[PDB]
Amino acid sequence: FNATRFASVYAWNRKRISNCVADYSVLYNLAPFFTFKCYGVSPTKLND
Amino acid sequence: EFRVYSSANNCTFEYVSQPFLMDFKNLREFVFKNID
Q1: What is the dihedral of CA B4, B9, B15, B17, to 10 degrees?
Q2: Shortest alpha-carbon distance between residue B11 and chain A (Å)
Q3: Planar angle of CA A27, A40, A12, nearest 5 degrees
Q4: Which chain A residues are within 8 Å of B14, Cβ to Cβ?
Q5: How far from B23 is each of A30, A47, B19, B26, B27, CA to CA, in Å?
């Protein structure tokens, strides 16, 4: 989220992210958040 | 010295901690169990 250089959309990376706790509450300090329409599990059911 | 394997691929699990080997005058018993 807070990186410096991003990848292009034809050379998009895939980093496997595992073996932690997944805190999704660090997504509020950015620009005023134009897109969070989810297609799966609800945002209120992400922390459980 | 990486003289065990030759080619690498997508890893699934990584783990670093205190080493299993510690300290012919010492017995080291080991039991491995892969269930569920």
Answers
A1: 40
A2: 9
A3: 65
A4: 19
A5: 51, 43, 11, 8, 10
